[PDB]
Design a protein around this nucleic acid. Structure first.
Ligand SMILES: CO[C@H]1[C@@H](O)[C@H](O)[C@H](OC[C@@]23C[C@@H]4[C@H](C)CC[C@H]4[C@@]4(C=O)C[C@@H]2C[C@@H](C(C)C)[C@@]34C(=O)O)O[C@@H]1C
Lengths: 67, 211, 144, 185, 60
RNA sequence: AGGAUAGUGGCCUACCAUGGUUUCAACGGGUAACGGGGAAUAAGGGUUCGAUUCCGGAGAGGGAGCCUGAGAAACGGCUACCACAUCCAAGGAAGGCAGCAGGCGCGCAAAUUACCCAAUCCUAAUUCAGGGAGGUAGUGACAAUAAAUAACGAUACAGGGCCCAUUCGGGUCUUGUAAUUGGAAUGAGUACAAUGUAAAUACCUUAACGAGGAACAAUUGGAGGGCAAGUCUGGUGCCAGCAGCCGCGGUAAUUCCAGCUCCAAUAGCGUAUAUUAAAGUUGUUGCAGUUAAAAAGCUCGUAGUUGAACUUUGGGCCCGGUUGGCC
């Protein structure tokens, strides 16, 4: 077989210039706890629908739905 | 047999809640669930499995049979093929109505009762077809028959005024008439073989059966 | 001689002459009139779906003596009433009136083929299943 | 979007497909060289027509044309490399007179039979796809490999073939294995 | 002329044909093998070269 | 001359004048017209196609208008009208898939509401974020490439072997043969495992398995002529039907249905529509016009095309790039 070979100077030196998937492939850094790409787009667009922190509106729907 | 077995897949899985519908990644057993992608090739009822050794659940007799008939016809001769297809479209929509073509070459929808015809006319008026429809009482397929042994041997001079055809008319045994349709007396049978089976078991003479 | 403009810069008289004389080709005239798109049961299509009106029995041309068992079909896309010849033995019992069939070209850019007069289409698929498969008993006609 | 990938047909059917003269002429090739279909021989014909014509419209020029001398040497180079044109007779006339049979002996399905292990071109053909030829250090699994005069001194059995070694054979294991239970009760 | 076509008896020969079952035949080698045997059958053991080479001669 | 525009310009306005284009085809009409690079075929010329991966143009249902911003008459910006549709508490409010998928109609006709920014790039305050731009996989017999369906022994010897081809009763080390018989090999496939990969499926690698009917069975069109291949067997009897054309079928069909056999192409083979070559049946190359279609009834004549001969020739010289039996 034929492929490529990269040898670095130190583990942290490799950890800083290597793609995240190679690190995950070698167990040096765990895959981040991340949801799917499509759900990320949904929650990003849901965030777009709210202007600001939304505490005032979350309370506002709380009292307005009480009656 | 390889009959009516459709090797396909599922387009989406949906759990219904009101009019809103959402995709479903998976649904375990013992659950109400909806799904798309098979509606086109489905026959409004059946069994869905991932194997051929499984079997089909009993066809629901409906306990209520589609009986009342009414004719359906197009406003325009040019418009005949446009909404002739909608008959199949509505037949899927409701698990009883059976759209077909009657023996008068006319399309009949058979419903369970009076207002079951009502529900399936505005959709043809508006939803499943736009062109209006003329709704008329069905025409039945009668027929003309004799029993009274036409006395004079009929005859007719050919247009050349050279040849003539003598002939007679008389009835048929009723079970023979059924057997002609029922295939017991079959045109596919050999003239010899068919003559034997109709001359002895049914009232006939071997002379006429061979003719 | 030779009866054509042959000057060094006479290409105007040569091009307009060929341009004018080009119209005598039957095939070229069809393209530049758009007769396939305008005046044809098929708008240039190679096939077409239709609905059966009647099953016709047509005497063949002389010297042939046969009945050709055609079907009078209406085109869905333009409503034109045509005829189509159902090939192979029988296969007219295969179809019924007011059924759905696919009509293909019949071989000869118009030019009704064979001893059959007045028909320029042949049936290929009926109700979605190929007539050839039905003839060879590969499939069967669904009752819908 | 994606840049397109260029592809071209490698054959061309005869203008009249049905000629008993050229038909059984190619059946004689098919039987002698063990071809599968005549696409396999049409391809060589299309390659031959391409190569001769490119050398044909170029043979119209003088002996001192830069296109000829530069191309032709390369043309002959691969021809003498493969051996469809032998290591002698390296002239342009020999190229345009080159026979299809000359190409079909440069197919790897030819030289497999020639140096044994086959006793039949069809045995030679089948063992090739049976992965039973080591060509260089790589097994070639095509008949039409157009051998360039090198592997001839390198052709042998596959290293993993039981005819090369290291495997006691699928069925050759099976019958021997169940022989222990078959030797008695 | 005659235009009153009768269609009831369509399919006459097929609906009256003698249904004979296909005779089972030994499996046919095919591929390079077919071209092999086909080449040999018409160049080595040609059973009938009567008058000239013949592909499909009957009982004669 | 001014206005307006970023700027020139009837681009708009005031006044003036009567021009401008056109048989070299203006103008009008059609376009099943986006243009081009190009694609198909192709001796050479051509002919046809070019919606389509690239370069420009235009459009975001139809028009029109406008803010914003360097850059928009933008539409995954806005307003109005028209057309459609959208929820509703009837009070209003929300709209632009010819973006990605995906869902009707329509039709002969066209795929997942899949995964990912890893690659190519692009955007940003920028290594980092994002990108249905793109990429990967799913469907895909659009097309293109390579190429499984099978070897090897002996089956009456039905073949120059040989004692000069005898007596083929003799291995006739080679050619074919009863679905009768034996030993190898191999992928298709299944799957440890690695691995490819962003993560995977496949590819390539590979343990255990995985062939006897090697049911792990290759089909599509044909067998009168063109056009390769039956005057074989049964039926059909101008009927069915076949047949691109000629034509077959009328009781012994080389053409119909079949079976057998054979032929062609082969994981491909037909059918249909259009198109190119064939077509020198569009013609410049390169047609024809007495009779086959076609020389206008004849003449005049503008545009168009075509248009007689004639003017520095010859002779020398010098420099200066050669092939070869006198390197
Ligand atoms: C399940 O659906 C079935 C039944 O409802 C029932 O058998 C119904 O019978 C209808 C008739 C069927 C008769 C035969 C098929 C041939 C003659 C037909 C009829 C005509 O007179 C008799 C009954 C009643 C008729 C009328 C309708 C004109 C039929 C018809 O369909 O035309 O047919 C439908 C399709």
């Amino acid at each position: 077989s034929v492929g490529f070979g990269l040898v670095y100077n130190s583990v942290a030196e490799a950890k800083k210039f290597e793609p995240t998937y190679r690190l995950v492939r070698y167990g040096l850094a765990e895959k981040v706890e991340k949801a799917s790409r499509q759900q990320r787009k949904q929650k990003k667009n849901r965030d777009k629908k709210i202007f600001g922190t939304g505490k005032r509106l979350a309370k506002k729907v709380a009292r307005r739905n009480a009656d | 047999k390889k009959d009516d077995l459709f090797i396909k897949a599922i387009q989406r899985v949906v759990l219904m809640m009101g009019r809103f519908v959402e995709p479903i990644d998976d649904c375990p057993a013992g659950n109400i669930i909806g799904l798309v992608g098979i509606d086109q090739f489905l026959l409004k009822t059946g069994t869905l499995t991932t194997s051929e050794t499984a079997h089909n659940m009993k066809v629901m007799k409906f306990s209520v049979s589609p009986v009342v008939q009414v004719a359906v016809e197009v406003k325009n001769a040019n418009d005949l093929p446009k909404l002739v297809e909608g008959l199949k479209r509505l037949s899927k929509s409701d698990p009883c109505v059976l759209t077909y073509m009657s023996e008068s070459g006319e399309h009949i929808v058979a419903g369970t009762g009076e207002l079951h015809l009502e529900i399936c006319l505005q959709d043809l008026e508006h939803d499943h077809a736009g062109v209006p429809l003329k709704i008329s009482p069905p025409v039945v397929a009668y027929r003309e028959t004799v029993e009274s042994e036409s006395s004079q041997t009929a005859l007719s001079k050919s247009p050349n005024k050279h040849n003539r055809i003598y002939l007679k008319a008389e009835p048929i045994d009723e079970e023979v008439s059924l057997a002609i349709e029922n295939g017991i007396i079959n045109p596919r049978d050999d003239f010899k073989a068919r003559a034997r089976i109709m001359a002895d078991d049914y009232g006939w003479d071997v002379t006429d059966a061979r003719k | 001689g030779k009866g054509k403009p042959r000057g060094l810069n006479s290409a105007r008289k040569l091009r307009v002459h060929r341009r004018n004389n080009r119209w005598a080709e039957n095939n070229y005239k069809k393209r530049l009139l758009g007769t396939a798109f305008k005046s044809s049961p098929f708008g240039g299509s190679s096939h077409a779906k239709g609905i059966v009106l009647e099953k016709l029995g047509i005497e063949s041309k002389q010297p042939n003596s046969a009945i050709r068992k055609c079907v009078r079909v209406q085109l869905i896309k333009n409503g034109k009433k045509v005829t189509a010849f159902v090939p192979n033995d029988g296969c007219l019992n295969f179809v019924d009136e007011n059924d759905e069939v696919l009509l293909a070209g019949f071989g000869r850019k118009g030019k009704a083929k064979g001893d059959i007069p007045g028909v320029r289409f042949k049936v290929v698929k009926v109700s979605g299943v190929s007539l050839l498969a039905l003839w060879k008993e590969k499939k069967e006609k669904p009752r819908s | 979007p994606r840049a397109p990938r260029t592809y071209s047909k490698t054959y061309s059917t005869p203008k009249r497909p049905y000629e008993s003269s050229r038909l059984d002429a190619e059946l004689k090739l098919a039987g002698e060289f063990g071809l599968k279909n005549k696409k396999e021989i049409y391809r060589i014909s299309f390659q031959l027509s391409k190569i001769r014509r490119a050398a044909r419209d170029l043979l119209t020029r003088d002996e001192k044309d830069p296109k000829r001398l530069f191309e032709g040497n390369a043309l002959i180079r691969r021809l003498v490399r493969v051996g469809v044109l032998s290591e002698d007779k390296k002239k342009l006339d020999y190229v345009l007179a080159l026979k299809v049979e000359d190409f079909l002996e440069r197919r790897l399905q030819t030289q497999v039979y020639k140096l044994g292990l086959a006793k039949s071109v069809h045995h030679a053909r089948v063992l090739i796809t049976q992965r039973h030829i080591a060509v260089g250090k790589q097994i070639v699994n095509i008949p039409s490999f157009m051998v360039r005069l090198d592997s001839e001194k390198h052709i042998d059995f596959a290293p993993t073939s039981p005819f090369g070694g290291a495997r006691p054979g699928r069925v050759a294991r099976r019958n021997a294995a169940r022989k222990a239970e078959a030797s008695g009760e | 002329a005659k235009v009153h076509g009768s269609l009831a008896r369509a399919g006459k020969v097929k609906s009256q044909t003698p249904k004979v079952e296909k005779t089972e035949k030994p499996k046919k080698p095919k591929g390079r093998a077919y071209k092999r045997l086909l080449y040999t059958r018409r160049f080595v053991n040609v059973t009938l070269v009567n008058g000239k080479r013949r592909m499909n001669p009957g009982p004669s």
